[PDB]
Design a protein around this motif. Structure first.
Motif, PDB file in Angstrom:
ATOM      1  N   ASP C 445       0.852  -1.179   0.000  1.00 24.86           N
ATOM      2  CA  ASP C 445       0.000   0.000   0.000  1.00 24.86           C
ATOM      3  C   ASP C 445       0.891   1.233   0.000  1.00 24.86           C
ATOM      4  O   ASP C 445       2.084   1.179  -0.310  1.00 24.86           O
ATOM      5  CB  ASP C 445      -0.905   0.060   1.221  1.00 24.86           C
ATOM      6  CG  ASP C 445      -1.587  -1.234   1.526  1.00 24.86           C
ATOM      7  OD1 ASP C 445      -2.508  -1.635   0.785  1.00 24.86           O
ATOM      8  OD2 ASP C 445      -1.211  -1.813   2.570  1.00 24.86           O
ATOM      9  N   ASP C 447       0.054   3.427   2.844  1.00 23.38           N
ATOM     10  CA  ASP C 447      -0.271   3.939   4.204  1.00 23.38           C
ATOM     11  C   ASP C 447       0.951   3.737   5.106  1.00 23.38           C
ATOM     12  O   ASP C 447       0.818   3.054   6.144  1.00 23.38           O
ATOM     13  CB  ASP C 447      -1.552   3.332   4.786  1.00 23.38           C
ATOM     14  CG  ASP C 447      -1.530   1.839   5.055  1.00 23.38           C
ATOM     15  OD1 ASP C 447      -0.787   1.425   5.963  1.00 23.38           O
ATOM     16  OD2 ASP C 447      -2.279   1.108   4.387  1.00 23.38           O
ATOM     17  N   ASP C 449       3.860   2.078   4.473  1.00 22.47           N
ATOM     18  CA  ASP C 449       4.586   0.774   4.458  1.00 22.47           C
ATOM     19  C   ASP C 449       6.107   0.985   4.401  1.00 22.47           C
ATOM     20  O   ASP C 449       6.543   2.101   4.049  1.00 22.47           O
ATOM     21  CB  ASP C 449       4.082  -0.121   3.331  1.00 22.47           C
ATOM     22  CG  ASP C 449       2.761  -0.770   3.667  1.00 22.47           C
ATOM     23  OD1 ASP C 449       2.407  -0.763   4.857  1.00 22.47           O
ATOM     24  OD2 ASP C 449       2.093  -1.261   2.739  1.00 22.47           O
TER      25      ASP C 449
HETATM   26 MG   LIG Z   1      -0.085  -0.427   4.219  1.00 19.86          MG
END
Ligand SMILES: [Mg+2]
Ligand SMILES: NCc1c[nH]c2nc(N)[nH]c(=O)c12
Lengths: 99, 79, 1337
Positions: C445, C447, C449
DNA sequence: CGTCGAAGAGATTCAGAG
DNA sequence: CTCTGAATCTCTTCCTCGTGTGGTCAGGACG
RNA sequence: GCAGAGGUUCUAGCUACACCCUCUAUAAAAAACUAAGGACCACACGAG
């Protein structure tokens, strides 16, 4: 961001010593070895396992080879295996290597 | 620079043989003093081997023949 | 350099040979003085000098003094690395038995003496004498004695013999016995043994004895007398922490053992009383046990803070031990870490990299380049200028970074594509960029990572990360041929918004010269993006072999589609960019481009498509607003009517008409119907309701609602989630798995009540808690699957075999789940597939099947095609190339060497994250009904009646392909007849599921054989039919007198003669099962098809896959027919029903005990075949393998796994399942030894026995017969060829003890035994080098 | 101045009838 | 009565990377 | 360290794998050569 090239090592000579405030290399974990084996890549696996991580006669050799100009390799044999051999030999079990 | 190596692996079918046959060519360009037959242009010594293999100038037989010729030339100087 | 390793039990002399000194003083070091004690656990003299080339007294300090042991301090001067290699030993004052060889599961020290473990535990702990050298007495050498009983024996027997005590007694018993002597007497006893259990125990003991007498071992060696100590540097030690030197490690155990031994020595030389010496020896034994393995007893010795301190055995096994922490997963240098960023601009062969990270990664390269430039004279100056970060250093860094791939590795790399290569592009900032199209294979992703960056150093590594690992090299995933770089979220939405049509937008009906002009006519704003127009297009065709044919026709399409034409390469036709272009269409477009254009013109296409998609999703402005999520007007009325219906059912329940459960079920059903109705209303008001003008009246058109466009295009979300945004949420589940009576009648755009949210939180909590178990179980399954195959490598190019498993389309009765054009593609046929016109060989027997062949197979419409598979390959130590088929990563036959053992394990264990952890049959379409192996009987009603349950209802069209399959009950009545074309919609079979009909094979009268009314059948008065109906008493309920008789029905004529079954002399006998309600009477003719007796009547989660692979026996195993024969009974269920099956040709010694509660679908007049089912129920893999060969277990253990994986929608090619199956049934058992040297009872690997018998048959002597066997993955891995291959997987203590006792030497040859050692693995590019080296020997 | 829970296989227990 | 299976007890393993805080022997005299 | 001795510097610098220079009794004229001691346990956090 943490990236490191060379630095202090541990008692078991697994050089990275653990990524933290102190210098460390990200763990080439158990699954990453399988992900390497899935490809045909073995030389990069050997350099992840012997020269980079723990080979007292491999690190000090390739640190001189790289600055010299030639990117060669010499496997040696990991110090962790020489530790496992002792930890089994000290158990009353004789484990050796043939020739 | 090369991004897709599919042209090379047609010359060396295995594509595992390709890496082993290009490593020797790259070593003969880094340690050994030999010069690349392909016109070098800013490229490193590891993609020049793949470029040579793409042109069909290098395979698993040509480099062995060349090293045999080097051995014979060394034998000539031994007298 | 060195061959394989060997492991054997350590002799007491070898330990003395190892050690350099001898430790006598417990204290490691003086606290006051840093230098170690002379006899301490840390010692300079024994374990070498503390500092390099320095003694302890400081007399010698230079290399010229090396090799000379100083006489003052007494330490031999040498390097410090000798402190990790030397060893020391303690001399125990009393012999002490090893704990690994005592408390392990088989307890070899007990199996070697044939005495209970408890007696050894007692004598080892100084509480019970054991007789030694009994002589001519009433006390045996294996007798256990008690202290008071020992005293009484002393008083009774005046002869000097006496039972010893402690580990010395066990040592003396071990020494006294002769291993070679007991072998012959044990063999004779085994031959004379009348039972198989006792003979099995004898075989275990004899195998242990043979293992001891073959290898160089001495049983006395199980009781160590001298004990080695670990080298000092091996102790973890304590870093200077202010003067504490404190941590919990081995030194405590070593100190306590030395203290106990010293106390024992002092007591022994002090002539202490036996009551104290015994206690001291017991304490010493406990200390040694704790040192070797802390916790093998009930008491766990613990230091301070009440934590169980580590011991030696605790530092080998487990996730903390060496084998899984320091040998396999070594941490590496030249690494890095950072967060992810979109990185859109870089091509898919390059990725971003911060400068402040690439400077530190490539430091040695920078030093070398500076030295070459001459800027730095020495390394010191180079380091200084690197730390300066001046202008020259960056210019150097832009050189070593030019063509140097790096490996962007995601954290949980489940499958092969987890770790890929990229070419760096230096950027500022502090985040690692990433090409968006590869953010799917990583499952990464944005978000926050975190990926880790590695670097290849050697030239071979640089070339490998270019020829195998570059992101442009793995386009197709190894699990299935479908592409893995499918455009995911924004580009797909942009393309979907580009390829559409509005019935009236400016620029409608115009003619356009070409796409070069369409792009200009759209950029100017003179024409909208969607407008039906007429354009001309140069459609290039590859129909001529190797040539591009250019055809140009005035095609009708939109402006947006025409603009999209220039991006696509020339070879592709125009029938792909003309449709609506959702997501699956884009993936198929990429796949066709790869198929018909190669790889080089597909990387460019897939890189250009993202640019276009982003650029035309930015111009779209596809935003989400509240007015988008329309609430259908019908919802309020539907809610009111559902409330009325539930109120009606409530009033009925309050009137007592309906039961509570029935009312609950009705309420659930009506609520589900209302939910579906409101969902349909919302969908119809969401997609169609758009209405606009066509230059005239109003016209209908598919919607432009943004929420709908994010669902139709498949960019993100499906109709199910939109159902939760506009329509009602539906019915939610309670934590215990029940459905709440009242569903949530409120959507998310509307307000959600307090109760309707407290109910909703149950599902969220359960789903979030299931993550922490789904991942925890998938990890273990993947690890077991990896370590069970772990060694399959394609070494041989052709087995040359002939047999291959069958392949047929799979249908459950609906649409065909998988056509023969899907499973077969990518494999190689076994026998010549024949054209439907007979004697015509369409395709040869050994040709690979690519797309141009599967297309031909579609024309001829063939259902059964033989295919070679890795289960029937005969190459030992590796599968063939032909037997494995297409590589599924590159569309060519797999290269000789690729490591396919791990690929399948990763591809099966990868979808383990998204996988969920938990009448009348109407025909589908018109066609002809075909019943395979049916015995049809015409009933009174004229409807077709199948005799046996095994007949299945299938439909056959003019193409012969089975459109559907239906399971039908035994003896049922079917509306339609076999071999008759039926129409769609109508049911071909109708029956009452509750009632089980019992029909007869042939027509005739009924005769009650071995039957008495009131003994086997008790007539029960039926109040419904108006006649007492004959009800068979149950076997466990009826009297013992009727138990002896067998309730049966016989067919007879009108005179009284017995009518024989056609073919068999014995007349047909129909045994009436218990609790059977027969309407007819004794002596009434039976219609062939009429129901004589009306008898009233998987888990797709991960555990099913785990149980399938583990080969676990099912709870209620269906029994089968071992050998074809006629069913017969030998007893009358005296404790258990007895079944005897005898062939008509050979007499049978095989009789089967049957539980009395298991229904028998067979009749004693019926003749069964080999592999025929006897009692219905789930089947056991073990039974199938030894009954129907090896090819039959595959067709079940692959079908079931695919059935589990089809529900979630994930696709895994069959060969990945098949190689795990092949690795399962790798061990074999020999029925008879023959001329080979293998003992008949032992188990040997299939490859070894196959090669041995083939070599024997090469000479006159005949080989050994073998019987195949099946083992679960977790048990097959632990019994592999190499001890170190299975000692790093599970159960380290047992595996190591078993290897050490037998002296089982290794041979490496694996993929883990070489990873551990640290050499070229024989998987990929190292295979040639290993092959070479083998050829050298 | 050092010095003195679940869950599953497997190995014990243990049993039942002809 | 002696295996026959049938309970019954015992050992094993239960993901994979990071980011961080804090706390911690051994064994106190002893001549 | 040519062997012994001393050594510019760019921590320390005949071994750590080491390496080179000048000099003849003891330090002083000079450039090119390397990368170090860090265990266990609790709590909280993030992602798949
Ligand atoms: Mg993520
Ligand atoms: N440290 C004194 C000295 C100056 N130059 C040197 N060069 C080498 N190879 N070694 C050294 O020890 C020195």
């Amino acid at each position: 961001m943490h990236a490191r090239s060379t630095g202090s090592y541990s008692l078991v000579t697994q050089q990275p010593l653990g990524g933290k405030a102190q210098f460390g290399g990200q763990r080439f974990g158990e699954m990453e070895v399988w992900a390497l084996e899935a490809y045909g890549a073995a030389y990069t696996l050997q350099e992840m396992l012997t020269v980079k991580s723990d080979d007292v006669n491999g690190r000090t050799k390739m640190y001189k080879n790289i600055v010299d100009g030639n990117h060669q390799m010499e496997p040696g044999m990991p110090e962790s295996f020489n530790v496992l051999l002792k930890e089994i030999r000290s158990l009353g079990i004789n484990i050796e290597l043939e020739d | 620079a090369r991004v897709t190596v599919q042209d090379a692996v047609e010359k060396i079918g295995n594509r595992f043989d390709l890496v082993l046959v290009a490593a020797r060519r790259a070593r003969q360009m880094q340690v050994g003093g030999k010069d690349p037959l392909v016109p070098e242009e800013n490229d490193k010594t590891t993609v020049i081997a793949l470029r040579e293999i793409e042109e069909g100038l290098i395979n698993n037989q040509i480099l062995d023949v060349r090293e045999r010729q080097e051995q014979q030339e060394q034998e000539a100087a031994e007298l | 350099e060195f061959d394989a390793i060997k492991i054997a039990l350590a002799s007491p002399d070898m330990i003395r040979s190892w050690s350099f000194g001898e430790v006598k003083k417990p204290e490691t070091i003086n606290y006051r003085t840093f230098k170690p004690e002379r006899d301490g656990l840390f010692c300079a003299r024994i374990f070498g000098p503390v500092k390099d080339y320095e003694c302890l007294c400081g007399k010698y300090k230079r290399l010229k003094h090396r090799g000379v042991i100083c006489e003052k301090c007494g330490v031999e001067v040498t390097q410090t690395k000798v402190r990790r290699e030397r060893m020391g030993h303690i001399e125990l004052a009393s012999p002490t038995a090893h704990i690994w060889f005592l408390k392990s599961l088989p307890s070899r020290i007990g199996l070697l003496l044939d005495m209970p473990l408890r007696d050894i535990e007692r004598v080892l702990y100084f509480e019970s004498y054991v007789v030694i050298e009994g002589g001519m007495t009433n006390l045996e050498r294996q007798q256990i004695l008690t202290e008071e009983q020992y005293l009484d024996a002393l008083e009774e027997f005046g002869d000097e013999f006496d039972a010893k005590m402690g580990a010395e007694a066990i040592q003396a018993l071990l020494k006294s016995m002769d291993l070679e002597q007991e072998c012959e007497q044990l063999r004779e006893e085994l031959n004379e043994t009348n039972s198989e259990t006792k003979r099995k125990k004898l075989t275990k003991r004899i195998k242990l004895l043979e293992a001891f007498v073959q290898s160089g071992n001495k049983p006395e060696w199980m009781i160590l007398t001298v004990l080695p100590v670990l080298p000092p540097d091996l102790r973890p030690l304590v870093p200077l922490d202010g003067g504490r030197f404190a941590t919990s490690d081995l030194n405590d155990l070593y100190r306590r053992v030395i203290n106990r031994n010293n106390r024992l020595k002092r007591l022994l030389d002090l002539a202490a009383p036996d009551i104290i010496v015994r206690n001291e020896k017991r304490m010493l034994q406990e200390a040694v046990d704790a040192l070797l393995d802390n916790g093998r007893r009930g008491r766990a010795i613990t230091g301070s803070n009440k934590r169980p301190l580590k011991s030696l055995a605790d530092m080998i096994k487990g996730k903390q031990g060496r084998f899984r922490q320091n040998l396999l997963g070594k941490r590496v240098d030249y690494s890095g870490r950072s967060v992810i960023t979109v990185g859109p601009y870089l091509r898919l062969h390059q990725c971003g990299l911060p400068k402040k990270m690439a400077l530190e990664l490539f430091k040695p390269f920078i030093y070398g380049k500076l030295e070459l430039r001459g800027l730095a004279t020495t390394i010191k100056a180079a380091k200084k200028m690197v730390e300066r970060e001046e202008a020259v250093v960056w210019d150097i860094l832009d050189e070593v970074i030019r063509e140097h791939p790096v490996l962007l590795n995601r954290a949980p790399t489940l499958h092969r594509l987890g770790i890929q290569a990229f070419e760096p592009v230096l950027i500022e900032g502090k985040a690692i960029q990433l090409h968006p199209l590869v953010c799917a294979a990583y499952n990464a992703d944005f978000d926050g990572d975190q990926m880790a960056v590695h670097v290849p150093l050697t030239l071979e590594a640089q070339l490998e990360a270019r020829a195998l690992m570059m992101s442009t090299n793995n386009i197709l995933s190894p699990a299935n041929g479908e592409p893995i770089i499918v455009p995911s979220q924004d580009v797909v939405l942009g393309l979907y918004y580009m390829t559409r049509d509005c019935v009236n937008a400016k620029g409608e009906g115009m003619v356009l010269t070409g796409p070069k002009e369409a792009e200009r006519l759209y950029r100017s704003g003179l024409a909208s993006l969607h407008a039906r127009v007429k354009v001309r297009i140069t459609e290039y065709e590859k129909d001529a072999n190797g040539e591009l044919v250019a055809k140009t026709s005035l095609k009708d399409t939109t402006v947006g589609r025409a603009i999209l034409w220039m991006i696509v390469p020339k070879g592709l036709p125009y029938s792909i960019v003309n449709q609506a272009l959702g997501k699956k269409a884009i993936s198929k477009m990429l796949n066709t481009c790869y198929r018909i254009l190669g790889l080089k013109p597909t990387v460019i296409f897939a890189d250009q498509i993202m640019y276009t998609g982003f650029a035309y999703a930015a111009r779209s402005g596809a935003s989400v607003g509240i007015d988008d999520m329309v609430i259908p007007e019908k919802k309020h009325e539907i809610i009111s009517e559902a409330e009325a219906e539930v109120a009606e059912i409530q009033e009925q329940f309050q009137s007592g008409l309906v039961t509570a459960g029935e009312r609950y079920n009705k309420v659930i059903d009506i609520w589900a119907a209302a939910n579906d109705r409101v969902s349909k209303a919302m969908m119809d008001n969401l997609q169609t309701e758009t209405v606009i003008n066509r230059d005239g009246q109003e016209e209908k058109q598919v919607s432009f609602n943004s929420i709908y466009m994010m669902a139709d295009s498949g960019a993100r979300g499906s109709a199910a989630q939109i159902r939760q945004l506009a329509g009602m949420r539906g019915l939610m589940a309670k934590p215990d798995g029940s459905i709440i009576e009242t569903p949530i009648t409120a959507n998310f755009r509307e307000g959600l009540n307090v109760l309707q949210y407290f109910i909703s939180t149950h599902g969220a909590r359960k789903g979030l808690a299931d993550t922490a178990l789904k991942t925890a179980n998938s990890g273990y399954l993947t690890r077991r699957l990896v370590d069970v195959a772990q060694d399959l490598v394609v070494t041989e190019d052709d087995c040359g075999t002939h047999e291959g498993i069958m392949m047929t389309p799979v249908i459950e009765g609906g649409d065909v789940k998988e056509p023969l054009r899907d499973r077969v593609l990518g494999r190689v046929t076994a026998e010549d597939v024949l054209k439907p016109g007979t004697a015509d060989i369409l395709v040869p027997r050994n040709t690979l099947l690519h797309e141009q062949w599967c297309d031909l197979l579609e024309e001829n419409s063939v259902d059964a095609v033989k295919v070679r598979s890795v289960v029937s390959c005969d190459t030992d130590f590796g599968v063939c190339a032909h037997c494995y088929g297409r590589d599924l990563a590159r569309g060519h036959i797999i290269n000789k060497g690729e490591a396919i053992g791990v690929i399948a394990a990763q591809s099966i264990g990868e979808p383990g994250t998204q996988l969920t952890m938990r009448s009348s049959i109407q025909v589908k379409n018109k066609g002809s009904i075909k019943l395979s192996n049916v015995k049809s009987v015409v009933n009174s009603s004229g409807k077709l009646v199948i005799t046996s349950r095994n007949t299945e209802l299938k439909l056959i069209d003019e193409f012969g392909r089975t459109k559907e399959s239906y399971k039908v009950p035994y003896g049922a009545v079917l509306a339609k007849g076999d071999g008759e074309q039926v129409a769609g919609g109508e049911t071909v079979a109708n029956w009452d599921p509750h009632t089980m009909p019992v029909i007869t094979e042939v027509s005739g009268f009924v005769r009650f054989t071995d039957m008495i009314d009131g003994q086997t059948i008790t007539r029960q008065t039926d109040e419904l039919t108006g006649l007492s109906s004959l009800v068979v008493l149950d076997s466990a309920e009826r009297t013992a007198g009727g138990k002896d008789l067998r309730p049966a029905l016989k067919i007879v004529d009108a005179q009284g003669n017995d009518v024989l079954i056609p073919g068999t002399d014995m007349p047909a006998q129909y045994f009436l099962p218990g609790k059977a309600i027969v309407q007819l009477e004794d002596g009434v003719q039976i219609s062939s098809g009429d129901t004589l007796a009306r008898i009233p009547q998987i888990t797709g989660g991960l555990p099913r896959v785990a149980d399938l692979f583990e080969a676990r026996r099912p709870k209620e195993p269906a029994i089968l027919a071992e050998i074809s024969g006629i069913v017969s009974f030998g007893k009358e269920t005296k404790g258990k029903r007895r079944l005897v099956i005898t062939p008509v040709d050979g007499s049978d010694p095989y009789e089967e005990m049957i539980p009395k509660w298991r229904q028998l679908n067979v009749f004693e007049g019926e003749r069964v075949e080999r592999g025929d089912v006897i009692s219905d129920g789930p089947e056991a893999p073990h039974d199938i393998l030894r009954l129907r060969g090896v090819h039959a277990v595959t067709r079940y253990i692959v079908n079931e796994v695919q059935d589990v994986y089809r529900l979630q929608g994930v696709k895994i090619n069959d060969k990945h399942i098949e190689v795990i199956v092949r690795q399962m049934l790798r061990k074999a058992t020999i029925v008879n030894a023959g001329s080979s040297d293998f003992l008949e009872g032992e188990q040997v690997e299939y490859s070894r026995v196959k090669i041995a018998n083939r070599e024997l048959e090469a000479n006159g002597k005949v080989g050994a017969t073998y019987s195949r066997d099946l083992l679960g993955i977790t048990k097959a891995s632990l019994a592999t060829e190499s001890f170190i291959s299975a000692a790093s997987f599970q159960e380290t203590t047992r595996v190591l003890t078993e290897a050490a006792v037998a002296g089982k030497r290794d041979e490496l040859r694996g993929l883990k035994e070489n990873v551990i050692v640290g050499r070229l693995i024989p998987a990929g590019t190292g295979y040639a080098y290993h092959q070479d080296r083998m050829r050298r020997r």
